[PDB]
């Protein structure tokens, strides 16, 4: 979807960042504006922003029930006191509005001024909701009533009159008013349009989308209470950064028993040096038939014992090395009775065959996976190293 039209730019104006407010009247239709009726008085408090707006009301018009208004004024105001009266005359001359705050934080809201080819934004200093007030009924009720007639743990924090007192601490501020009809409004309107070059490369906004996603989705845990030793199986397909490559190879050869060289670069990926992994491999594996097999001691640490439900015994890798040497000597081992040579129970022999061999009917056990072109990788030297190392291990094993 290519662009069609109106690639309009946007600019930020800081002139009125701490000066703009947004009033709204839930009870008043948008088609009925207040600009026509003259305004008289307004008040505000800077902290815990709230306002009190006083509105004049027409009395000469017929829809003003004069008798009802006189009754209301008599009910709310003194009969002849008039020293401090809510209304100057014997009828109500004004009605009042009160504000309610909406949300504590308004950082994510902004006021936008549209103009041909450009948008001018400005942060808001607050949002307030205005309603008409019915306090004059309360005043009338109060006048009617007055005509009729080792301390325990503190809990005053949660009381309403506490908050009323705290709000009353703040002194009132009186404001002058100018209507929308006044040219003063148009004059003040100029401050929205921030000046400057139309085309500017902003210095900020350098974060790439990856950093933005990181920023607006912070990690759930800032610090974990334990370290990932990973003795058992863990997330494998993700090459954990905290897990060094040597231990990666260790755990991988601990999981899968026999594996050709190619799948190693398949799994670690091409980012890792193919020559360095040789080190770990020769510490942790050897070429039987051109494919690596894990040491016995990695699977059988010297402080362990036969875990299988057959015969417990001291940890005897030598049987595994023996069958492994048999696999090196011949393509497949027909000997069912390896137990006769190495004297373990048959179940142990079957377990040992299981890791690296597969059954063929009436034909003994065969190596699980086939030969490979071991010379393709240019390390015949390590091949010879393995070869006479196994010559030495065979010499050692021949003692029994």
């Amino acid at each position: 979807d290519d662009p069609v039209v109106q690639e309009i730019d946007v600019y930020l104006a800081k002139s009125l960042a701490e000066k703009l407010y947004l009033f709204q009247y839930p009870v008043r239709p948008a088609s009925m504006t207040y600009d026509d009726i003259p305004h008289l008085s307004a008040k505000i408090k800077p902290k815990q922003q709230k306002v009190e707006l006083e509105m004049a009301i027409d009395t000469l018009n017929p829809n003003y029930c004069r008798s009802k208004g006189e009754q209301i004024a008599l009910n709310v105001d003194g009969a002849c006191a008039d020293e401090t009266s809510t209304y100057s005359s014997k009828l109500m001359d004004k009605q009042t509005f009160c504000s309610s705050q909406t949300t504590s934080n308004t950082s994510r809201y902004a006021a936008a001024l549209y103009r041909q080819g450009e948008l001018h934004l400005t942060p808001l200093h607050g949002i307030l909701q205005l309603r008409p007030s019915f306090s004059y009924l309360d005043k009338a009720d109060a006048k009617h009533r007055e005509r009729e007639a080792e301390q325990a743990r503190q809990r005053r924090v949660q009381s309403y009159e506490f908050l009323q007192k705290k709000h009353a601490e703040e002194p009132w501020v009186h404001l002058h008013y100018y209507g929308l009809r006044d040219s003063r409004s148009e004059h003040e309107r100029q401050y929205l349009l921030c000046p400057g070059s139309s085309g500017v490369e902003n210095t900020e906004l350098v974060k790439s989308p990856s950093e933005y996603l990181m920023m607006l989705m912070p990690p759930s845990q800032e610090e974990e209470k334990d370290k990932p030793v990973a003795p058992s199986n863990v997330l494998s397909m993700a090459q954990l950064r905290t897990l060094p490559l040597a231990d990666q190879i260790k755990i991988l050869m601990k999981n899968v028993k026999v594996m050709p060289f190619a799948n190693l670069m398949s799994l670690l990926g091409p980012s890792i040096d193919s020559v360095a992994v040789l080190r770990g491999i020769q510490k942790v594996a050897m070429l039987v038939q051109g494919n690596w097999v894990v040491k016995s001691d990695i699977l059988y640490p010297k402080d362990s014992s036969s875990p299988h439900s057959g015969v417990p015994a001291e940890v005897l890798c030598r049987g595994r090395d023996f069958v492994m040497w048999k696999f090196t000597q011949s393509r497949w081992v027909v000997r069912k009775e390896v137990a006769t040579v190495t004297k373990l129970c048959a179940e142990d022999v079957k377990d040992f065959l299981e890791h690296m061999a597969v059954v063929r009917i009436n034909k003994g056990w065969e190596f699980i996976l086939p030969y490979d072109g071991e010379f393709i990788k240019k390390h015949p030297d390590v091949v010879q190293r393995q070869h006479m190392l196994w010559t030495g291990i065979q010499a050692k094993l021949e003692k029994v």
């Binding site: 014992s305 036969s306 875990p307 299988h308 439900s309 417990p312």
Partner: protein
């Protein structure tokens, strides 16, 4: 974490499921309970149908 070989020393069955308590020699199982969710609007028709 014990292997069957070691299970044999403790006189326990490797197949045993576990998950119960032993109190004064008898094996006690705290069964799973079932209950309705809290903080949910329920519309219901009274016994009188209202």
């Amino acid at each position: 974490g014990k292997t069957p070989a070691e299970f044999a020393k403790l006189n326990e069955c490797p197949l045993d499921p576990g998950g119960y308590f032993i109190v004064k020699g008898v094996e006690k199982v705290i069964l799973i309970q079932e209950q309705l969710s809290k903080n949910r609007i329920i519309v219901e028709a009274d016994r009188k149908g209202a």
